[PDB]
Design a protein. Sequence first.
Length: 386
Amino acid sequence: GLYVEKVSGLRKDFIKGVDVSSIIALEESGVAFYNESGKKQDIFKTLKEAGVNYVRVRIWNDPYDANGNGYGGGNNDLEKAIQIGKRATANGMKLLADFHYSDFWADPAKQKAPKAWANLNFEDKKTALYQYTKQSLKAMKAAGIDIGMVQVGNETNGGLAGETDWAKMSQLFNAGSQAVRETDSNILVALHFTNPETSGRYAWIAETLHRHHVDYDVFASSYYPFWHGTLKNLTSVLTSVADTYGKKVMVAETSYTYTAEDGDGHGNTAPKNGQTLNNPVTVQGQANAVRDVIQAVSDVGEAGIGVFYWEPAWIPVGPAHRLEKNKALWETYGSGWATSYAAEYDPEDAGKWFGGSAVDNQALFDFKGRPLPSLHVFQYVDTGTP
Ligand SMILES: OC[C@H]1O[C@@H](O[C@@H]2[C@H](O)[C@@H](O)[C@H](O[C@@H]3[C@H](O)[C@@H](O)[C@H](O)O[C@@H]3CO)O[C@@H]2CO)[C@H](O)[C@@H](O)[C@H]1O
Ligand SMILES: [Ca+2]
């Protein structure tokens, strides 16, 4: 019963990706996924059959405390990145390695240096960052992973690896980029920023990147309709960067709520009072949103290479009523967004908010691992629904 109006002018090699970084922690938590038919099956194979052709994976340097207690959020480190890559490549999907260059969540307010770089002079940190990237890529290559793109930083709107000075950030961006270039010329180098509604931000950032000679190919943007303004604006600011700097552009993160119900007992990110919700909070609504962002990026023209849906499967480890038994899993396997063990690294945020999934209601699978009809959006954008 799912409807999807054909996206206009959609290039056929358009990147249709998903970031399922939490898949490992979730699977270790006993969560399982199925397919249309209803039979237990590797999520990566279901994704492939759904038309997905790219997988994004976040990577934290050392997402653990001194004792080896994962910080949660999927406890995404190089090792899991390799497990995800191997499976992604095994299912004919390229990989986007997302380096946060931090031990935990890296966003507009958090860009903490990895503990190992905690007190290194800038010069040594810069070479550390390059070394890490270099070795991490090399490890992936050895595992036979098909790396199509690398993200040097995640939503680095105001910082990267403990640095906030753009001159230093650019040098770090370049250090990271350098490692990619030395690894494989075909790998696209992407920089990721967010909050495209902010007047002039992207224009200012692209110029700064220019002024400091940052070597990158993709100007990536996050896009959550409930905070990031209009689709008209997204297309506009991205088209400006593409045209002005000759960069490719894409949406590295996007999603939408298919239900207002919190499935595991941990307050969800959306929907909330005040957020913009142009599409109904339903499966069709979610599909409309995904299809619209794809349209928006495609409207950039030749430079709009794709859209990655962020966490389409961060479903509940258990029902909302087992809240306490759920916490046990979130804590043991880090299958929640954060564990109490991350209080050290991130005292203010993770410290007082740790728990489970904050986006289970934004997945493309139901709380039981069964795909929602909206998962069909990746295929239907090319043709439309009969
Ligand atoms: O759970 C109910 C409350 O959640 C709060 O959100 C918390 C953090 O404030 C928020 O930053 C964090 O988000 C994670 C990460 O930091 C972010 O960069 C990434 O994009 O998403 C992660 C989770 O998906 O999530 C926790 C717990 O939700 C809200 O701020 C609060 O209003 C309320 O909803
Ligand atoms: Ca939840």
